[PDB]
Amino acid sequence: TNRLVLSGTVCRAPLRKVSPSGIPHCQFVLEHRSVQEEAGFHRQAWCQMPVIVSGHENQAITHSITVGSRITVQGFISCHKAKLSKMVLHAEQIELI
Amino acid sequence: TNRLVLSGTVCRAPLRKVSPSGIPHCQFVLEHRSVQEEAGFHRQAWCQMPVIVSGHENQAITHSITVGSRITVQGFISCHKAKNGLSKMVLHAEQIE
Amino acid sequence: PVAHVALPVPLPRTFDYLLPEGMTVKAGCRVRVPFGKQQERIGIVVSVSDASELPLNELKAVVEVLDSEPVFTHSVWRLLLWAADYYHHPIGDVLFHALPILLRQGRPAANTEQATAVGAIHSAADTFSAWLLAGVTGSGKTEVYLSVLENVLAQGKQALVMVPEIGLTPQTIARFRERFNAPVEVLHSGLNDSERLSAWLKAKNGEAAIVIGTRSALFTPFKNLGVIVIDEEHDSSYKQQEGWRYHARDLAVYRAHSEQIPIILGSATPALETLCNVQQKKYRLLRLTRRAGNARPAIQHVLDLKGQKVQAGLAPALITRMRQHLQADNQVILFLNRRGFAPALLCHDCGWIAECPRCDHYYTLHQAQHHLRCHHCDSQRPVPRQCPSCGSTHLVPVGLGTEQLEQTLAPLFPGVPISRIDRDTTSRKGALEQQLAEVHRGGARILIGTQMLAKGHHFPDVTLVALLDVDGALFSADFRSAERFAQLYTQVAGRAGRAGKQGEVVLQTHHPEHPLLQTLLYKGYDAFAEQALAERRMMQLPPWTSHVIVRAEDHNNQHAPLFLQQLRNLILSSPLADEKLWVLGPVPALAPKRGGRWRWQILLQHPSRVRLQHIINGTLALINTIPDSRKVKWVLDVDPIEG
DNA sequence: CAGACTCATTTAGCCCTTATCCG
DNA sequence: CGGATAAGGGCTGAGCACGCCGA
DNA sequence: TCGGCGTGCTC
Ligand SMILES: [Zn+2]
Ligand SMILES: [Zn+2]
């Protein structure tokens, strides 16, 4: 069991690159600001999440993700060591509004 | 919408450092191992995302963790602060098996 | 004629009044005189003349003359005038501060080395000879005091004994009463008004032989004063910091000089200025190091703190040493100059820390009382449950305090009682005695306390002294912090061990290679004092120069900077000021906000104190041209002990 | 593991308020 | 039971008639 | 029409 759903705005600029295998790749950092529940007391939650989508055909949404009121990305998440990007996101499903 | 579903084993023994005016907290590290597959190739998922349990309502389930056990923790993703910037990314557990 | 009358008014001017025919007054006589159309206040006559600035018919009359004899003696009056001129304070306030409270309203006035030192003091008699007694803690300072006092009393004169704190008065008056058949009397703010007036009258008459008290006992007149004794001259209690800010030691030295009587200053750790005067041949030193009665010196150790598994602020080596000493049925004392449970409360999510708006200072956490208390304005606040910024409930105590130490050493030591003493737990007079009673019972006990452990209390069953969180004296902006830390460390370490048992001292720090710590640990306090005095000689510091600080407090941080800039401009634009004068610009003090009011200061430096005094007098005469002098609280502090 | 130089202790006005001893 | 006295606190260690401004 | 706040002076 490994899945994530996150809603937030984009940060910096959406980089789009083509892998040598022919699968387009888009990398961007998501800015999240929301309020959640913690021990029955409401508190705000915030984080910065780099998203590296590696879709080929279903990633057509990436052409219009630079500007968006609500950007939602869903799919697998896994982080790694960086000997400064430690927590990374490489989901596949992307939704706008 | 900020919700994360994850499963795996425990890496570090849990800590029960209490807080003033009650509201105890649990400090332990979750180890997750799985694989990801899609169109074109397959991906690997492995790192050590920490999990934080707060409040006395969930205190009765934090027991019997010991050192390694297959558990699933649900919750949102929030960051922390330190002298090295973000320095970590903890998971706020809401539902525990 | 016209009589000059001083009143308790913050103005450096003496009013002039017309004496009706048939009444005569002298210098320093209380006179009931009207002041405006409000009430007939009480004033003191400074001098009598024949001419006044105002027309003679314009002046008013004096209702009644309380005393036909001056309340102050000639020497006391001269000292009061000299101090008023030196400290740039209004004469009326200075004169009335030296009077008893009951008289202010006009109520009816109504060893081989020890023998050598005593012989030298006796030989230097009937002359102004200032002596300094320096030696290891536990020496025969009291024995030398008794010897010199009995030698003085052999001629039938009187004596004055000064102590820094009220709590030390009983422990020495008991010995004085036991040794001396002559009556003795105390005088301090602890006593009632009637008792203080009785002490004043007995001192004036001359029936009382020895007067023992704090800095307020220096102004008491004596029928025939023979010697002045100052104990623990390096203490900061001798320097007043409210109202008239004088120094007891300097005034006592001036009194000895004017009256031509011996004065003895005794302290284990002499102040830097005293040692500078000794080097300048102004004072005569006497070293009575006699091992404090064949008592072995303590063993000093330095333990590195970096990269160690500290359990509640204690290193494993320190824990093992404490356990070993407690196993041998000996008490252990730990020094931590903190109070409360945690010095600050920190949010684990966003880093928010509770801060006092009126002080810009982090709140101190108390767990027993369960509230946040400010240590600068005594504000009371409850312990927050959620962070006001992010709303998280992960507030964690951070830092170490005596309360936390007492809480956390219980699991480590199963059957070792723990005793903690500080200001918080000593709010009652009986509370102190019972806690000291428990220590005197012997056995095994752990003592946690602040600098209150360095007072007159002596524990004969403590063998290990450990200092915790000594950081702050090595990275301080103040140049006197090292001296204060060294004095405190010497006082605390001097109590380690006893004549029979060998003491051990362990110091915990993150910088064991610092020259200050090495010099203070592996060498005596005298070597560090000499090195620091030489270093200050290389620079320009108050031990070798004169510093006067003009502090200004602003309710809105607006008028103080401009007022201090105008004052600096007046200081620089004066024929009295020379190039050698060094004046720093308006900068915030060490505490930019203490009671909701911003603080700014100006530092004046000059190699000669007389020239600086003349410049300050000229500027004060020229203050009247500065606008907006109101609504700003400013004071002059001569030779500050802080900043 | 999360803050740096500090902190903390000390004596001495003044009017108003509260609680206690003595004739 | 009333008078005198000891212990504690809260802002302040100069203040009032006078004139100006906001409510 | 009346209360709160910013000035010299008091011999
Ligand atoms: Zn917070
Ligand atoms: Zn405060």
- CATH number for the domain harbouring residue B89: 2.40.50.140
Whether C295-338+400-536 and C112-292 are alike in CATH topology: the answer is yes
- Cβ of residue C9 near strand E, that is under 7 Å? yes
Method: cryo-EM
Contacts of C551 (CB under 8 A, 6+ apart): C589, C599, C600, C601, C634, C635, C637
> What residues have a C-beta under 5 A from ligand 1, the ion?
C 347, 349-350, 352, 387, 389-390, 392
**Which nucleotide minimizes the distance between its C1' and the CA of B80?**
D2
Judged by a CB distance cut-off of 8 A, whether residue C365 touches chain B is: yes
Question: What subunits make at least 3 CB pairs under 8 angstroms with C?
Answer: A, B
Contact present, C159 and C226 (Cβ < 8 Å) = yes
Q: Which of C349, C385, C393 sits opposite B81 (nearest CB)?
A: C349
Contact present, B78 and A34 (Cβ < 8 Å) = no
C546-638 placed in CATH 3.40.1170.20? no
- Chain B residues whose beta carbon lies within 8 Å of the beta carbon of residue A72: 1
Domains of chain C, by residue range, sit at 2-104, 112-292, 295-338+400-536, 546-638
Judged by a CB distance cut-off of 8 A, whether residue A17 touches chain C is: no
Judged by a CB distance cut-off of 8 A, whether residue C389 touches chain B is: no
- Please name the residue whose C-alpha is nearest to the C1' of nucleotide E14: C9
- Cβ of residue C630 near strand F, that is under 7 Å? yes
Q: Could you tell me which chain B residue has the CA closest to the CA of C372?
A: B20
Rounded to the nearest angstrom, the minimum Cα separation between B97 and chain A is 13
CA distance C442 to C444: 7
Query: Ligand 2 centroid vs C360 CA: distance in angstroms?
Result: 7
CA distance A6 to C446: 55
Six-digit token string for C31: 């006179």
- Cβ of residue C119 near strand E, that is under 7 Å? no
Residue C248: count other Cβ atoms within 10 Å of its Cβ. 21
Six-digit token string for B39: 């169109």
Query: Ligand 1 centroid vs A33 CA: distance in angstroms?
Result: 15
Contact present, C103 and C109 (Cβ < 8 Å) = yes
Query: Ligand 2 centroid vs C68 CA: distance in angstroms?
Result: 51
Listed residue (C538, C46, C443, B25) closest to A38, CA to CA: B25
How far, in Å, are B80, C559, C598 from residue C592 at the CA level?
Answer: 31, 15, 5
Encode C288-298: b = buried (16+ Cβ within 10 Å), e = exposed. Answer: bebebeebebb
Return phi, psi of residue C117, to 5°: -65, -45
C112-292 placed in CATH 2.120.10.70? no
* CB pair distance less than 8 Å for B2 and A87: no
Which numeric CATH code is attached to C2-104? 3.40.1440.60
* Nominal resolution (angstroms): 3.2
- Strand, coil or helix: what is B6? strand
- Ligand that comes closest to the CA of residue C355: 2
Contacts of C163 (CB under 8 A, 6+ apart): C169, C172, C212, C213, C214, C231, C232
Question: What subunits make at least 3 CB pairs under 8 angstroms with A?
Answer: B, C
* Sequence-separated contacts (24+) of A89-93 with Cβ below 8 Å: A89/A4, A89/A6, A89/A30, A89/A49, A89/A50, A89/A51, A89/A52, A90/A51, A90/A52, A90/A53, A90/A54, A90/B43, A91/A4, A91/A51, A91/A53, A92/A53, A92/A54, A92/A55, A92/A58, A92/A59, A92/B38, A93/A58
DSSP assignments along C191-216, one per residue: S-HHHHHHHHHHHHHT---EEEESGG
* CB pair distance less than 8 Å for A41 and C393: yes
CA angle C362, C368, C371 (to 5 degrees): 40
Domain of residue A20 covers: 1-97
Split into its structural domains, chain B has a count of 1
Which numeric CATH code is attached to C295-338+400-536? 3.40.50.300
Listed residue (C452, C453, C448, C368) closest to C409, CA to CA: C448
Annotated binding site of C for Zn(2+): 347, 350, 356, 359, 374, 377, 387, 390
CA of C497 to C1' of D8 (A): 25
Return phi, psi of residue C285, to 5°: -100, 150
CA distance C609 to C627: 28
How far, in Å, are C19, C238, C267, C270 from residue C287 at the CA level?
Answer: 57, 23, 11, 11
